[PDB]
Design an enzyme around this catalytic site. Sequence first.
Site, PDB file in Angstrom:
ATOM      1  N   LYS G  86       0.777  -1.186  -0.161  1.00  0.00           N
ATOM      2  CA  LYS G  86       0.095   0.005   0.062  1.00  0.00           C
ATOM      3  C   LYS G  86       0.945   1.244   0.039  1.00  0.00           C
ATOM      4  O   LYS G  86       1.862   1.362   0.937  1.00  0.00           O
ATOM      5  CB  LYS G  86      -0.882  -0.123   1.048  1.00  0.00           C
ATOM      6  CG  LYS G  86      -2.042   0.882   1.258  1.00  0.00           C
ATOM      7  CD  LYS G  86      -2.703   0.794   2.510  1.00  0.00           C
ATOM      8  CE  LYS G  86      -4.254   0.176   2.379  1.00  0.00           C
ATOM      9  NZ  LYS G  86      -5.119   0.636   3.396  1.00  0.00           N
TER      10      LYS G  86
HETATM   11  C1  LIG Z   1      -6.137   1.234   3.167  1.00  0.00           C
HETATM   12  C2  LIG Z   1      -6.539   1.578   1.838  1.00  0.00           C
HETATM   13  O1  LIG Z   1      -7.233   0.385   1.203  1.00  0.00           O
HETATM   14  C3  LIG Z   1      -7.257   1.171   4.286  1.00  0.00           C
HETATM   15  O2  LIG Z   1      -6.784   0.411   5.673  1.00  0.00           O
HETATM   16  C4  LIG Z   1      -7.554   2.376   4.738  1.00  0.00           C
HETATM   17  O3  LIG Z   1      -6.453   3.222   5.150  1.00  0.00           O
HETATM   18  C5  LIG Z   1      -8.895   2.741   5.699  1.00  0.00           C
HETATM   19  O4  LIG Z   1      -9.965   1.983   5.002  1.00  0.00           O
HETATM   20  C6  LIG Z   1      -9.137   4.160   5.990  1.00  0.00           C
HETATM   21  O5  LIG Z   1     -10.439   4.323   6.810  1.00  0.00           O
HETATM   22  P1  LIG Z   1     -10.503   5.501   8.051  1.00  0.00           P
HETATM   23  O6  LIG Z   1     -10.711   6.780   7.094  1.00  0.00           O
HETATM   24  O7  LIG Z   1     -11.400   4.990   8.816  1.00  0.00           O
HETATM   25  O8  LIG Z   1      -9.164   5.529   8.477  1.00  0.00           O
END
Ligand SMILES: *[C@@H](CO)[C@@H](O)[C@H](O)[C@H](O)COP(=O)(O)O
Lengths: 223, 223, 223, 223, 223, 223, 223, 223
Positions: G86
């Site tokens: 990521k």
């Molecule tokens: C990574 C990208 O897929 C995920 O873990 C995102 O960081 C989260 O979905 C972020 O969500 P929040 O706004 O609740 O931190």
Amino acid sequence: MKIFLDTANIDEIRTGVNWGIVDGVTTNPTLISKEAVNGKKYGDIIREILKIVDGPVSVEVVSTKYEGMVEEARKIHGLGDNAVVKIPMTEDGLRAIKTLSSEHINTNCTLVFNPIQALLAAKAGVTYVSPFVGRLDDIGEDGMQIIDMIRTIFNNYIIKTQILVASIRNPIHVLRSAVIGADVVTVPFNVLKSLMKHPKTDEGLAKFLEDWKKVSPDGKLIL
Amino acid sequence: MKIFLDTANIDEIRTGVNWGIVDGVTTNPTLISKEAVNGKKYGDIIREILKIVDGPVSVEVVSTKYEGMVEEARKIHGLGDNAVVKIPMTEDGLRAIKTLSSEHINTNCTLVFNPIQALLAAKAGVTYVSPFVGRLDDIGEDGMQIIDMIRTIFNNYIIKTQILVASIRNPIHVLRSAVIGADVVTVPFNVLKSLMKHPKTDEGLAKFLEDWKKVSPDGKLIL
Amino acid sequence: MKIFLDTANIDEIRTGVNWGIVDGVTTNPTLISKEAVNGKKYGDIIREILKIVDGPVSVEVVSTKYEGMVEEARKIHGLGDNAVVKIPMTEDGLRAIKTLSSEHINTNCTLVFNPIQALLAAKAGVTYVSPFVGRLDDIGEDGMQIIDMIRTIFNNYIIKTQILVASIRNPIHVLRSAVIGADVVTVPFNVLKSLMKHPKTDEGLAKFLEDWKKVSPDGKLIL
Amino acid sequence: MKIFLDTANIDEIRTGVNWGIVDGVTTNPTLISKEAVNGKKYGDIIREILKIVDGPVSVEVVSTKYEGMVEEARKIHGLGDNAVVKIPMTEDGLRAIKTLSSEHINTNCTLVFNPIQALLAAKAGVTYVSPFVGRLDDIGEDGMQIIDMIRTIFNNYIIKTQILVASIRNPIHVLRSAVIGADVVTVPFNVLKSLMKHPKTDEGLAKFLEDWKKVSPDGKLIL
Amino acid sequence: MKIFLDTANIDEIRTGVNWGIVDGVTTNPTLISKEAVNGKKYGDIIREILKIVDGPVSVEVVSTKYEGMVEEARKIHGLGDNAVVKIPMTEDGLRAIKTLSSEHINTNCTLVFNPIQALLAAKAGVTYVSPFVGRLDDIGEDGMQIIDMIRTIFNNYIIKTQILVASIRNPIHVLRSAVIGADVVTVPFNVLKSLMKHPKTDEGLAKFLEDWKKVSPDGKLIL
Amino acid sequence: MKIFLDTANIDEIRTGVNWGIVDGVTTNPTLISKEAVNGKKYGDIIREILKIVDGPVSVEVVSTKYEGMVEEARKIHGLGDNAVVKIPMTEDGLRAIKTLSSEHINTNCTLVFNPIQALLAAKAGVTYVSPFVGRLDDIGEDGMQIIDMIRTIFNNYIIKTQILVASIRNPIHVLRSAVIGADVVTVPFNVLKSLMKHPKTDEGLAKFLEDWKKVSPDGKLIL
Amino acid sequence: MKIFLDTANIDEIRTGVNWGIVDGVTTNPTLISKEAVNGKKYGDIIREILKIVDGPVSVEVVSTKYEGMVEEARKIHGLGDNAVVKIPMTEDGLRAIKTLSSEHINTNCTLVFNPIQALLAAKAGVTYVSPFVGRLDDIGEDGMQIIDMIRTIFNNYIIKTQILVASIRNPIHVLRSAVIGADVVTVPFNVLKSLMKHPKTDEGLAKFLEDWKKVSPDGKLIL
Amino acid sequence: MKIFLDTANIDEIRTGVNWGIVDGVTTNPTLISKEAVNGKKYGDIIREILKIVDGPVSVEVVSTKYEGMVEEARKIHGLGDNAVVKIPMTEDGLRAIKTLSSEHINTNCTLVFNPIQALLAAKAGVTYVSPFVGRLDDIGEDGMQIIDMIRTIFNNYIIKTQILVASIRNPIHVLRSAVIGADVVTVPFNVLKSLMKHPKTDEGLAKFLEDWKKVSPDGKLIL
Ligand SMILES: *[C@@H](CO)[C@@H](O)[C@H](O)[C@H](O)COP(=O)(O)O
Ligand SMILES: *[C@@H](CO)[C@@H](O)[C@H](O)[C@H](O)COP(=O)(O)O
Ligand SMILES: *[C@@H](CO)[C@@H](O)[C@H](O)[C@H](O)COP(=O)(O)O
Ligand SMILES: *[C@@H](CO)[C@@H](O)[C@H](O)[C@H](O)COP(=O)(O)O
Ligand SMILES: *[C@@H](CO)[C@@H](O)[C@H](O)[C@H](O)COP(=O)(O)O
Ligand SMILES: *[C@@H](CO)[C@@H](O)[C@H](O)[C@H](O)COP(=O)(O)O
Ligand SMILES: *[C@@H](CO)[C@@H](O)[C@H](O)[C@H](O)COP(=O)(O)O
Ligand SMILES: *[C@@H](CO)[C@@H](O)[C@H](O)[C@H](O)COP(=O)(O)O
């Protein structure tokens, strides 16, 4: 979308052909009769247009009866391979179209003012159908709506007849035909010439020219 | 879109067929019994129409029971290969269509007034389904909307039953059918005769011929 | 929405008037000439209709020139305060409408086929304008679309001329007129009678009456 | 939106009234026949409903002819000021409504299945009109679409007749009626009962109770 | 649009009120019982919130029966003129709202999950109705759609019951409520605190203050 | 669109199959409990339906736990190749569907009330999913809107699970399902019966018969 | 649509994985640092998640510079073929994505807040792009509108990058994602568990089981 | 969608090229003349850009006559295989494009301000057409509407000419171009850099970094 010139004026045709933006020409009995004056003969006008234009050239029969239409149609066809025979939307004309189509003579059904007339011409096997948008505008109906309906109907039935928008009066008939997806527009010379022009093109060209002379007084590109 | 003529009047049929715009004929017990008077026999009327018309000809059974419908259907089929058996939308009718389809006898389900009845007919394997738009108009419902829903339903499931728009009263039923994409319309003679006509076609032809005389007194096209 | 009867037939008029659903009558030279047969005189027919119908009764001038139209209009007017003078959409007709409106004679501009014709009639001071929907349908254009545009135009300018939908052919012209919000429809007798009817009304009444007989053998409602 | 109960069952009526949610009642000859059994008399049933209900109570005439309808209507009106006379959509019915309107007797035109029938009833001066949505659903047409058209037509002409949606079968007829803006819905008791309920209301109540126990074991709110 | 704070947490309430953006408070048995722990009494929590908040404060009855709801309602009303009695959408609740309305005691109908429940509450005369959007989201239905339908229904009938959007979970519930035109939203503290904030506000302020220092080292505006 | 009968009544099933319009059957524990009375055994009822019906027959497990569901599913599958195992939308249910899918046992996930539940069932490999439209209507939400969303979602991902619309209450659920493009509807017998019928079909039949009598007194079609 | 779990909590992951509904997992530095407490190490957490989850597992680099990101990405990649790297939407992140894509290392571009950011990530060759809907909702913009635009843009250019909707806060983010046609949603544990549930599923199951006990006292299904 | 840099500044181009997000470059006589000052020669500038940019580089002729345009185009072509010859929308320009296309020299028709000019360019065989959106915005017309029409027209006729959106002034020109489906956008450097940025991206990274510090004081990711 093909663009044809809608005129029998040889000078206009030669000019448009010379521009390389004319794909064909449409005539009709009124346009030819305008030009066949002062000793000008219609037979000569027609042959000259056929010679000058590579593309389709529509020439209209003048008989109103089936037998005369088919005979005239055959003569028009004999004048050259790019000749297309223009036939009016009448009972006799649909009959002529059916016969001519089976003889592999290309045809253009004219004087069409609604979508069902257009569908009947297509069912006769016509090569092109020509709805008259400007004459509809003249009587207070938006003629481009008929083109839109004809495009939908032909799409529904995978119809191969080409939609040839005629009686064009301005560049927006042209723009709307393209957005609808008409196969062909035929345009008068005045409209044709306006299609390439825009005041911002002119102004843009002038500014580029001016800025270029800052770095090249002679105004040329030396590479 | 196929265009059928909705009548049992043999004179209307001969005329329509000579025009070249009639792809088939539909009849029903009312239409036939209208003509089967003053000595004229219904058996003769039906046979004559089958002989005259090259395309499909729908003839309706009169029995209301499964066995009688099938018996009549087979007699109708035997009168000529272009015969199509009209069967009403009833429990016995759906049974009869299913049997006749398995026997390769073409069928037309009639007296259809909503899109689900039309779907049931298609599920029985019917060749054509005939929703009645004018009779819905008669009771204050826009019948064309049912045609639109049927076209959608049939498209969704890739149904091969042809939609045959019936009870047609005016040329706008025809236009809307074409825009929707119905496979067939069947039209009364009066409506049929209006489809080719438009006042601007008439006026345009007159002008062309007046202008042509100016360069051809005899009004001909010598090429 | 007012509902007028479109006929010169005294029996139809007397019948509809006795139904309580007819708000006026429209005639025209064809409808009148249909009834003036077997020695029946057009002057008698007109007077008789004026007498029977409490509401507006439109009667068409036959002169095509301004002076004749106004002369005929004044005579029509003198036949009764419910008379409305029907005048065609022509140059002289507009001039006549403007003159008559100033004289406080009610007028109905007829033979209107597009919304700009209707606007010009309104600008001349006309009481009613009558677009002919069925005659547009005849030529492959959906006539109700013109009513919708006239309604919008009249609303834009708070025009007080009443839209009187004419050349009505079926109950969907009537339904669409009401949904658009036209001021008046005028309808042939066959159409008028059909407006009250529906098969579910009949079936529903039959069932109620059957159920009631279970509690009131004589079918009476004694309270 | 007013909500009426569509029943002649006295126990249902008393219960609904005592929920505080019922604004009137509609009956018809079927509903009454249902209750008038085992010695129970229709005249007693009708009086008792008029007695118990403060709001309008519709009671239907049984005569099919003008004179009988008006006679029975006057008797129904005489039973109490809240009585509304139900009259079917027929020729005689419309004449009766017109007469009764002039006598200041409230009326409800029933057995309406399209928007033009509703308009005719309104033109006769009816107090309420009752289109039967469920019975249209039965024949494969979405009955709520007729309510939508009637609302538009009535808005167009500033019509004061109230739209009373009838033949209601489920809570979505009710929801769509409210979103359209119908004046009244009349509903069977089982549908009425369902309108107050939702699984999340029940679950939310149970959870509030459970949470409150933690702070108050006896489940009281002592202030 | 009024903005209420949905909590019984007195610290959150004091803070929100000091910000100047809180027009009122809603509580429910879960929220109160959350705070009424470790010695803290619910009677004290309720009184303190009434004293702190100038605007409306909704407090829910716990009884499920008509007589108990009304008894509790009156005790709630007696605690201060800004108290609003929250009553659930049940048969007994509608009865209680109707009585309390006649006694001029302001009421809020809660646990509403569809537009018809909301309409019933308005018919009982409730001051506010509280549909729960987040709990509908929880079960896979877009709760805001119910708010949109309620706004339409209330507009249709000129209903004076205020729509109080509850079960709010995020600032888009708030934005959509405002665009729809709901009268009130009630929001949890976390959501409340986010409404004033945006990253471009923060960044723009920082830049303004950095640029200002360039002409005012001390960062002040001496005028 | 396939049409299944939603019942365990053997007489209904035989009758529908013998109309030729029924493509399969759905049962559930309630429907079966209804039939399994007065000595009639559920095991015999299930075998008899499997026997009589050529198309799919859905039979629901009763265990609420993974192991019991899979055990009962394997037994149901063993009764015949046309058996489809109905499994509720629960955690254990989804696990069971996944296992049974890998064993090539057809499955139908039931008690679905929103589009994401339907997607989860499809992701587990279910053969059919059954959203309950009528039960959503019961709680004041238009259940057909969930079918529309499921159709869109399934189209988006080219999902092969069939949408089987269940809890159908009227013919408009059926019509809207077809227009949306649901794979299957399952309908109670009384709704099934109604789909074939229309008052204009009946009236049209009667009139054809009456007209035919004039040309053939015995009402036969002799060819 | 794939469904990933958005957490670093091993218990939540193990639970969801045992449900059979979790297709992968996404983590980020905040989620991991939440779990690396009480002596729990981030390297152990990551390896344990890779081991438990068969599908893609996203793990975020922490370096902000190109060289560090690629070095960390390569180490992440070496932990198992299901690891996805990521990388944030920054200049160096795009450079890293382009390098890693060429090395056939799967990548997920995160911290995306508008559709053009997503397009740039796709142009760099990214495997997944993760727009953060909930964080847009937080700042008063409907985050789902960005998903819809990304879906359209990706469809226009036949882009193979998967749209992975992140920062999901409720089941309507999930429903809207499916209707739009996003490739993947990643959801917190609380949201995931709620997706299977509906009060009508519970109520329906309870009733079926009650009805079954009427025919099978032990509640068994013996076949 | 390809993304080009619209500039002649080598510093900007080298920066964008290093970012990896630039697919090509457009120049025009104004942009080049801006850089060719203080001793910089336009010939060195053009060559340097050709060298640095892997992808298409557009360089405009300065001649306004056919022969001069074609001569200049050939020189431009000879400078590198990635050279694209920009030619203005004029009569001689269309002639030049047709000739150059037959010589397999890539062309880009510039100074296009409506969709019919774009269609004419396509018909001449041009590789790219560049409508100027910002300059339409300047004169009070939304330039993006012209891009939408060109996309539709090109789709209708399966036109292979690429739409190159030029005169771009802000990131919403870019967003809208992508949603419409334009083939390429060319953007000034200030716009290009802005495309990667968003304040929530910056905020999100900062938070991730802070939280990771909790787990790894030195901010590294050791795996
Ligand atoms: C990574 C990208 O897929 C995920 O873990 C995102 O960081 C989260 O979905 C972020 O969500 P929040 O706004 O609740 O931190
Ligand atoms: C033939 C059909 O393609 C054409 O020459 C048409 O007759 C003209 O386009 C008609 O135009 P006018 O309305 O200007 O005669
Ligand atoms: C058979 C079905 O295609 C046709 O003959 C229909 O019976 C008629 O089209 C019905 O028309 P009417 O409503 O005018 O009788
Ligand atoms: C006068 C204008 O209101 C009317 O009588 C019209 O002439 C008729 O309505 C015309 O109808 P047709 O098209 O059927 O003649
Ligand atoms: C009178 C009109 O207000 C009502 O009682 C109607 O007759 C019923 O609502 C009709 O409903 P059914 O279709 O169930 O008879
Ligand atoms: C009372 C009605 O306005 C409020 O306190 C509601 O009970 C809450 O807004 C319900 O919200 P939750 O669904 O979050 O409990
Ligand atoms: C099984 C799913 O295909 C069906 O039997 C359903 O249980 C019924 O259709 C449910 O309908 P009810 O709401 O009338 O039980
Ligand atoms: C060439 C594409 O034909 C480009 O360099 C355009 O000239 C510029 O994009 C025009 O932008 P301005 O309107 O800002 O000059």
